[PDB]
């Protein structure tokens, strides 16, 4: 949809209007999307429902030595956004992975939806103050 961001801003407005009216909608958003609407980081356990095989990749990165990979990785990942696939930087070591798993999960959740999300948040915060 070429106007889709505007419709995402409309649905963010309608959600914030339902909240303002104190009326219940049958929305059941992900914990990731609720955190984004709250400005909270996601956690790797959220990946289990959205992309189990990437969660499993992160779990193979956790509690395992980088030496188990047998090849190197860096802070860059392939992301499909708007049907275009691009390799995007996130900014590897035993110190960096703590951020890789946080940051890579940020990229995987928001990167492909970041503009829809910004439109939704503009619709929401227009009517309901973020704080």
Question: Any overview of this molecule?
Answer:
This protein has six helices and two strands; from the N terminus they run H-H-H-H-E-E-H-H. It is elongated, with a radius of gyration of 17 Å. A hairpin with a 2-residue loop joins strand 1 and strand 2 (84-89). The longest helix has 18 residues, at 4-21. Strands 1-2 form a two-stranded antiparallel sheet. The two termini are 32 Å apart. It has 131 residues and is mainly α.
Helix run count: 6
Overall outline: elongated
The strand order across the widest sheet is 1-2
The fraction of residues assigned to DSSP E strands is 5-15%
State the end-to-end distance: 32 Å
Work out the radius of gyration.
17 Å
For the sheet with most strands, the description reads: 2 strands, antiparallel
Q: How many strands?
A: 2
Structural class: mainly alpha
Order of helices and strands: HHHHEEHH
Helix content: 40-55%
């Amino acid at each position: 949809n070429p106007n889709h961001l505007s419709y995402f801003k409309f649905v963010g407005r309608i959600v914030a209007k339902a909240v303002y009216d104190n009326r219940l909608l049958e929305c059941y958003f992900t914990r990731s999307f609720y955190k984004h609407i709250l400005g909270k980081s996601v956690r790797y356990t959220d990946m289990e429902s959205e992309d189990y095989h990437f969660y499993q990749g992160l779990v193979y990165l956790l509690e395992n030595d980088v030496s188990t990979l047998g090849y190197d990785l860096t802070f860059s990942t392939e992301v499909q956004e708007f049907g275009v696939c691009e390799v995007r930087d996130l900014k590897v070591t035993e110190e960096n992975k703590k951020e890789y798993v946080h940051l890579v999960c940020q990229m995987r959740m928001t990167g492909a939806i970041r503009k829809q999300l910004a439109a939704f948040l503009e619709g929401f915060y227009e009517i309901i103050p973020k704080r």
